[PDB]
Amino acid sequence: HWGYGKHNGPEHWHKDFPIAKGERQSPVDIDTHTAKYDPSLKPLSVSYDQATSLRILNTGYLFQVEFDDSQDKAVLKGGPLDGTYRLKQFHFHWGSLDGQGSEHTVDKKKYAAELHLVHWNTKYGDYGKAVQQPDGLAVLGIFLKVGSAKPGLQKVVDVLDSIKTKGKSADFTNFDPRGLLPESLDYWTYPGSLTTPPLTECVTWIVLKEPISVSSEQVLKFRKLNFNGEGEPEELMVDNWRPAQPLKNRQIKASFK
Numbered sequence: 577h578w579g580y581g582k583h584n585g586p587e588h589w590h591k592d593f594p595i596a597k598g599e600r601q602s603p604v605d606i607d608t609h610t611a612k613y614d615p616s617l618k619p620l621s622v623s624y625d626q627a628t629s630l631r632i633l634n635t636g637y638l639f640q641v642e643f644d645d646s647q648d649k650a651v652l653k654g655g656p657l658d659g660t661y662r663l664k665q666f667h668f669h670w671g672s673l674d675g676q677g678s679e680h681t682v683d684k685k686k687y688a689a690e691l692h693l694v695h696w697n698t699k700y701g702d703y704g705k706a707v708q709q710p711d712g713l714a715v716l717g718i719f720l721k722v723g724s725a726k727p728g729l730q731k732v733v734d735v736l737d738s739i740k741t742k743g744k745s746a747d748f749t750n751f752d753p754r755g756l757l758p759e760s761l762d763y764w765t766y767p768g769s770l771t772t773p774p775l776t777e778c779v780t781w782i783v784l785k786e787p788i789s790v791s792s793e794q795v796l797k798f799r800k801l802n803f804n805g806e807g808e809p810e811e812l813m814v815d816n817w818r819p820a821q822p823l824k825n826r827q828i829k830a831s832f833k
């Protein structure tokens with residue numbers, strides 16, 4: 577099965593998922609000098625006041641916080657997007673060391689982690705149909721750098737010991753994702769893909785320019801998760817990021833400058 581190791585990591589995924597070598601794969605390096613300011617882009621509309629978090633889950637590759645997406649409670653609109661995208665979940669990718677962990681890079685810089693808020697286009701009715709479409713998902717990506725703590729992240733960090741191993745979940749109600757956002761909503765955007773199998777090319781990526789600051793202790797706690805299930809040898813969950821992929825025939829657009 578796929579994963580992040582020597583024998584089943586990103587460089588092997590193409591054998592099961594040939595789209596790994598496709599024309600719109602993610603993540604990518606964001607060359608800030610060659611990204612084009614697009615005056616016709618709109619401000620993002622991030623409408624998260626009615627978000628209903630449900631559950632946090634160790635998938636065996638990362639952890640994710642899941643929301644009620646059975647109605648338009650928390651939605652993403654505007655920016656490069658046509659229509660209404662419903663928040664389904666968020667998750668992170670992170671490293672074994674503070675200078676790696678992000679999927680996107682900025683002028684080749686890697687951050688300690690990257691937060692992904694996954695949304696699906698409500699014109700397709702359910703998320704499983706939306707993944708079959710070139711404009712089915714919108715993922716909002718936010719970089720994490722190590723510095724001062726992020727208070728809005730601490731509820732997430734504190735529950736991780738209850739979901740140490742693959743397949744564990746825990747109630748995670750009443751969490752407000754607005755606490756994970758930086759001050760600015762300046763962004764880059766480009767068409768891309770899931771960054772894990774099945775690597776489907778169904779994502780409009782919106783990557784915020786401003787990272788959030790998390791403490792060394794918050795990220796250390798991410799690295800205490802396990803890829804393995806309970807009752808199996810411990811494999812620390814670190815380095816669950818895909819490296820930058822070829823940009824090919826794509827332009828990254830900037831909402832700013």
Ligand SMILES: NS(=O)(=O)c1c(F)c(F)c(S(=O)(=O)CCO)c(NC2CCCCCCC2)c1F
Nearest residue numbers: 635692694703704707715769770771772773774
């Ligand atoms: N980085 S990412 O946002 O492209 C991404 C993941 F890294 C990721 F691991 C997941 S996953 O845990 O579900 C593993 C399977 O790819 C999703 N989740 C979305 C993509 C999965 C298909 C259904 C669409 C909505 C969830 C996912 F979108």
Ligand SMILES: [Zn+2]
Nearest residue numbers: 667669692771
């Ligand atoms: Zn992701």
